[PDB]
Amino acid sequence: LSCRMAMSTYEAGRTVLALDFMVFTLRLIHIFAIHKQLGPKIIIVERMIKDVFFFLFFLSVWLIAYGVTTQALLHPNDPRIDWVFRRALYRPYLHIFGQIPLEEIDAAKMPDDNCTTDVQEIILGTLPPCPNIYANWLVILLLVIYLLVTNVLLLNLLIAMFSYTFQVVQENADIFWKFQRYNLIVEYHSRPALAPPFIIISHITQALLSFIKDLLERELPSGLDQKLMTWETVQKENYLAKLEHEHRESSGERLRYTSSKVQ
Amino acid sequence: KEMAHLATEAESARSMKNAKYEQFAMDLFSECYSNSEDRAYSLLVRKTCCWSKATVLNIATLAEAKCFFAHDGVQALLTKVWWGAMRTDT
Amino acid sequence: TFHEVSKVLKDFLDDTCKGFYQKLNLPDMDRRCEHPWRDLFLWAILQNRQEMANYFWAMGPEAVAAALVGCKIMKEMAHLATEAESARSMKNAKYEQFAMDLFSECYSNSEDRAYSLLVRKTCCWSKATVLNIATLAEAKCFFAHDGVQALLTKVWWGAMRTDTSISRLVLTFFIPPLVWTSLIKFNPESATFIRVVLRRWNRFWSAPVTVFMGNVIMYFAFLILFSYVLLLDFRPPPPYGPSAAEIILYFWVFTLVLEEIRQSFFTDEDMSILKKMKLYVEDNWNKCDMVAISLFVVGLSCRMAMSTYEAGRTVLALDFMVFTLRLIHIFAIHKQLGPKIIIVERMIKDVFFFLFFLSVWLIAYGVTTQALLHPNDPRIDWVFRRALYRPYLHIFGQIPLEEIDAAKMPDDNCTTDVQEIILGTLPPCPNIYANWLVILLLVIYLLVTNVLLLNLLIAMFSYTFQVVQENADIFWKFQRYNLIVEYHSRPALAPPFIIISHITQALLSFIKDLLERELPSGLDQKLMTWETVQKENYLAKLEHEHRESSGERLRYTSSKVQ
Ligand SMILES: C[C@@H]1CC[C@@]2(OC1)O[C@H]1C[C@H]3[C@@H]4CC=C5C[C@@H](OCC[C@H](CO)CO[C@@H]6O[C@H](CO)[C@@H](O[C@H]7O[C@H](CO)[C@@H](O)[C@H](O)[C@H]7O)[C@H](O)[C@H]6O)CC[C@]5(C)[C@H]4CC[C@]3(C)[C@H]1[C@@H]2C
Ligand SMILES: C[C@@H]1CC[C@@]2(OC1)O[C@H]1C[C@H]3[C@@H]4CC=C5C[C@@H](OCC[C@H](CO)CO[C@@H]6O[C@H](CO)[C@@H](O[C@H]7O[C@H](CO)[C@@H](O)[C@H](O)[C@H]7O)[C@H](O)[C@H]6O)CC[C@]5(C)[C@H]4CC[C@]3(C)[C@H]1[C@@H]2C
Ligand SMILES: C[C@@H]1CC[C@@]2(OC1)O[C@H]1C[C@H]3[C@@H]4CC=C5C[C@@H](O)CC[C@]5(C)[C@H]4CC[C@]3(C)[C@H]1[C@@H]2C
Ligand SMILES: C[C@@H]1CC[C@@]2(OC1)O[C@H]1C[C@H]3[C@@H]4CC=C5C[C@@H](O)CC[C@]5(C)[C@H]4CC[C@]3(C)[C@H]1[C@@H]2C
Ligand SMILES: *[C@@H]1O[C@H](CO)[C@@H](O)[C@H](O)[C@H]1NC(C)=O
Ligand SMILES: *[C@@H]1O[C@H](CO)[C@@H](O)[C@H](O)[C@H]1NC(C)=O
Ligand SMILES: [Ca+2]
């Protein structure tokens, strides 16, 4: 909004507000904690992130290699740095999602466009540069190998990682969701009773009452507190006695007793 | 769990990780919940005298005892709090 | 004669059993053995007698080394095994398990004598360190032990405390004067001030982790410089000169070659030159680097001439890929990034299976459709294009129906004459005699390849990942040990600077360790006795837990009640 109030930064303000809408929308993920089916998925996504980081390291290495190699082989005379980075990382990254523009990589499929080789004309953007087709069989072979590796090996390996991580996490994810649901319930327990923009009313009321003047964490009378302490102690004794009893009648203890007694 | 992070020798750290003191709390509270189920809630929400007026839920938050919060009794109390004066089966 | 047993031991170990019996050239027959239990264990081991060999191991002075040697000999003999039963028993030798359990007991006892046990020079095995024997036996499970990994972490962090945050290290590295500050903790132990500050500086910068991270950063710098030279400042042949940045790159790679030569001929001591070279080239990374160096040399040599200039540029560009892939090695140190490299290796074999199936089915479909669709195209390159290149791209969603489906063919200006087709004047007119067959075959191919084969490969990857996951951690632990050792031996300055360290080393050699240290006689004897006591306690614990096992209790009770 501050950048929006000024003409010299107006488009920047609009851009920042648009990017902030994404943050506000993603803040809506919190409500999913209450639902039992939608709860653990958020926690599972967190481990999915780490597997994604591993896959991104592998992708980054292999993609840098392939993209720089093909940019060197195909457009060796293009000085435009932005286009170097485009052809070296942006295009190979899109190759993962089925975007393979063979019109720029395969000599047979290149359009009969009007392209130039002069550096001055290339830099000024008058004409698109004419791709080098010296050894294009190498470019096609490298593209085939890259597609194989990235789309099959790497993607299926990431699917395997996700599958294994899901199987491992599933048990602990429910416990994490239970804790998250506790946190959500406590937060909405402490929250004032009116949703914003109305909240303003509750805040004004609270401040006015504070100037003018729980279900959880309640303190009990002395007698009830003492009775609860005694009841907890009795339950603890019963629990320990049950443990000791089930230990005495365990198979191993019975065998040890029988062996000593028979000896 | 704090001492395990501050642990030097491998054997002591290994024993400290497998402390299963939270398991004691879970089993004891399971027994308590199975007994009365109404005194157990007060046990969860009362202010302990030995630990400077600290609620058992407050300590569970402090220890980050996630497994304890997963207990059926704690979740039932949370559902009761969540639904307020309304019945939890609505 | 003892020559035969010496040569058998040479085949099995090749470095450890030197001088056991060639010393005196045979020793006089009357003189008693200096290490009787070692000889008896080794003799009992060479003939697959495990119970007798286990008994001899139980009485031997150095038990971890003996167990590791037994593991090596057993895995070698299993390969040389004829009868199935003996081979099966030999595979399940579990001598490495003895070493792991005994060292676990030792580590649980003191945790400081255990490190000395790992790094001391054993007297029975010809001054061979237990880690050296573990490397010899390739006892990957032993290296996975928590004690070995803790010692490796201690070596890796040098004088610095192993609990130091990575951020503290990086901030100290970028700003060297922070080293004298209390920012980063250090393990205990006018002119003096210069001496003490120099000692602290040297202690920080000689740590293997600092050397590693410096090498990583300047390998990134090398890749950036290589890419800049290749893509933006690559000039015509020397008539117009290589770029200054290209000259700097040449010097950089020359320093890399010097580093390789150092690792291949001057590593740690004076062993056989042929053996040293074999050990150097046995490492796959040392083959990758070698390929990179050779490709770079060929690339620059072809680059210096006008008649091969484009070929030189192509070779250099292809070499950049090798150099970039050489960067995978740094991933071994990280625990999350470590096992993934090992998992990819098994992924490769599953990929080979899928590639066999793909190759068969793709050849069938591609040749069939080329025959059906372009029967009059003589161009061999286009035959191979339409037969293998296009069907391979069908896997990744590239389905150009404009060339396969009659309804979707453009109204282009195509010819049917063979002369016009060969000369490339016009594209050939595809045959549409029975195009329904072409479409049906394309549909079947898409179904099979994209659904059945790809999902079957995903299933293979899923199953292999589940199987490998457990063993991958052990493999990563061994790989991390190798990386830590390599960066421990490495000089302290990353290339192209390396040149300085090499010059210093050569000048000092002409003018004039944490691992594999030799101990005084008293300390060595005390460590031997402590290991023997720990072994006895471990065996007693095994026997005790066996007596109070349920089965043994039942057997005793049955016999006694009868
Ligand atoms: C199962 C597994 C799958 C993967 C793979 O292994 C097996 O498959 C293999 C197959 C192989 C490929 C097989 C064949 C080839 C062809 C070969 O070129 C032969 C040389 C000739 C000549 O010098 C080049 O051709 C001609 O170039 C000219 C460019 O000036 C074109 O002019 C065009 O100019 C303009 C472009 O618009 C327009 O005027 C017209 O359009 C047209 O006039 C011609 O039309 C065209 O004829 C290069 C190598 C390549 C692509 C192989 C690469 C590797 C594979 C994919 C294997 C995999 C590992
Ligand atoms: C669930 C499962 C999925 C898979 C599958 O099984 C079920 O589906 C089945 C469906 C089936 C297909 C169903 C139908 C057909 C059509 C049939 O042609 C009928 C014959 C007629 C005539 O002789 C051919 O047509 C005409 O050709 C002409 C070519 O000269 C076109 O002229 C064009 O010329 C130029 C081209 O640019 C331009 O001037 C214009 O563009 C246009 O003037 C006409 O426009 C077009 O009308 C061939 C077989 C095919 C493709 C089936 C194949 C198998 C399936 C996919 C099954 C699967 C197993
Ligand atoms: C995933 C990483 C993020 C960081 C980075 O690499 C990928 O992004 C790339 C985008 C590049 C930009 C893209 C476009 C232009 C415009 C051109 O007129 C001048 C150069 C410049 C600023 C480039 C400088 C180098 C940059 C930041 C690259 C940078 C290493
Ligand atoms: C995966 C395999 C690799 C090996 C191979 O089959 C796939 O590659 C194919 C590429 C083919 C090339 C492609 C282009 C041309 C140009 C043409 O003017 C003369 C013929 C020639 C050299 C062809 C000869 C046969 C070749 C090597 C094929 C060879 C069996
Ligand atoms: C390509 O550009 C030149 C520039 O003079 C022009 O003469 C020619 O007509 C153009 N051809 C195309 C493809 O339009
Ligand atoms: C196709 O080629 C012929 C060759 O003479 C020409 O006469 C005709 O105009 C061309 N048609 C198209 C599609 O331009
Ligand atoms: Ca090397």
UniProtKB/Swiss-Prot annotation, chain A:
Sequence motif Selectivity filter, residues: 97-99
Entry's transmembrane regions: 12-34, 44-73, 136-170
Topology, Cytoplasmic side: 35-43
Intramembrane segments: 83-123
Subcellular location: Cell membrane
Listed result of changing residue 29 to A: The antagonist NDNA fails to suppress channel activity
Binding residue positions for Ca(2+) 2: 187
Extracellular compartment segments: 5-11, 74-82, 124-135
Summary of subunit composition and partner proteins: Homotetramer.
Family statement drawn from the similarity comment of this UniProt entry: Belongs to the transient receptor (TC 1.A.4) family. LTrpC subfamily. TRPM5 sub-subfamily.
Summary of the function given for this chain in its UniProt record: Monovalent cation-selective ion channel activated by intracellular Ca(2+) in a voltage- and temperature-dependent manner. Mediates the transport of Na(+), K(+) and Cs(+) ions equally well. Activated directly by increase in intracellular Ca(2+), but is impermeable to it. The activation mechanism of TRPM5 involves a multistep process.
Swiss-Prot/TrEMBL domain comment: Contains two Ca(2+)-binding sites that are allosterically coupled. The binding site in the intracellular domain modulates the voltage dependence and the accessibility of Ca(2+) in the transmembrane domain.
Protein name as annotated: Transient receptor potential cation channel subfamily M member 5
Organism annotation: Danio rerio
Residues of the full protein shown: 808 to 1076 of 1165
